[PDB]
Amino acid sequence: SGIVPQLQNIVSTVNLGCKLDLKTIALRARNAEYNPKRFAAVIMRIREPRTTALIFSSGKMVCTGAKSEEQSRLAARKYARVVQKLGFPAKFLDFKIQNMVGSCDVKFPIRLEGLVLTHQQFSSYEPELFPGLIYRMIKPRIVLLIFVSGKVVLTGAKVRAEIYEAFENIYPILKG
């Protein structure tokens, strides 16, 4: 197709294997937010990889904003080190990529009605609510937001190869 998508967001979770005290980690950290009146989790933000993490007292932690799996792993290790520095036996166990969202462009307009007429069983196009067509391909289980501008957003994959194959499979459908 001559076009390679650009991964923009990576979501991955990791278990620390130990209990945490949210008030302690929120009290001695400058980048920690904790408001138990609304949300019972700690929000932290690491700047160099430009990522944001959610920490729960049950020992689970999740990261968002990464660009690749290696950056997500680095952010998870940084957060584990931060938790360990606050007097907690945090561990880096059960790390697996949960979700990835990427963006791309085709550089030509796309008729959002021909797609829903030819691929009705794979998409739910409603211009009355949202302008972008929502395509749900079942073989890789990928969700795609398509616009008249040609730029397409892909989500639901587990590895970069899945995003690549989804894009290379949806490209002839958009071109046709």
Partner 1 sequence: CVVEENDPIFERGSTTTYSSFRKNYYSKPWSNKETDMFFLAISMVGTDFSMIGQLFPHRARIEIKNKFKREEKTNGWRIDKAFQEKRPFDFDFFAHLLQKVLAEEEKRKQK
Partner 2 sequence: RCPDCGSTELVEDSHYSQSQLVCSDCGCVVTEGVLTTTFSDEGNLREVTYSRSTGENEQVSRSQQRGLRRVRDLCRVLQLPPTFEDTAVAYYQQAYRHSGIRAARLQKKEVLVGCCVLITCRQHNWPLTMGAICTLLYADLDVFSSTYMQIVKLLGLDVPSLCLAELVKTYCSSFKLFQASPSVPAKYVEDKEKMLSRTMQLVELANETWLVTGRHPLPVITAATFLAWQSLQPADRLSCSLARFCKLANVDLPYPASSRLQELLAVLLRMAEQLAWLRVLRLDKRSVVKHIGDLLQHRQSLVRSAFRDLLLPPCMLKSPKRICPVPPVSTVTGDENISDSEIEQYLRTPQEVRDFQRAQA
Q: Maximum distance among all alpha carbons in the chain?
A: 59
Q: In what order do the strands lie in the sheet with 39-46?
A: 32-35, 39-46, 51-55, 60-64, 6-15, 93-105, 151-155, 142-146, 133-137, 123-124
Q: Is 66 in the site for partner 1 (CB under 8 A)?
A: no
Residues contacting 140, CB < 8 A, separation 6+: 156, 157, 162, 165, 166
Is 111 known as a binding-site position?
Answer: no
Q: Which is nearer to partner 1, 45 or 111 (CB)?
A: 45
Interface positions, 105-134, toward partner 1 (CB under 8 A): 128-129
Binding site for partner 2 (CB under 8 A): 6, 27-31, 48, 67-68, 70-71, 73-74, 77-78, 81-82, 85-86, 103-105, 107, 109, 111-113, 116-117, 120-121, 124-129, 131-132, 134, 136, 147-149, 151
Contact string 26-65 vs partner 1 (x = CB under 8 A): ----xxxxxx-------x-x-x--x---------------
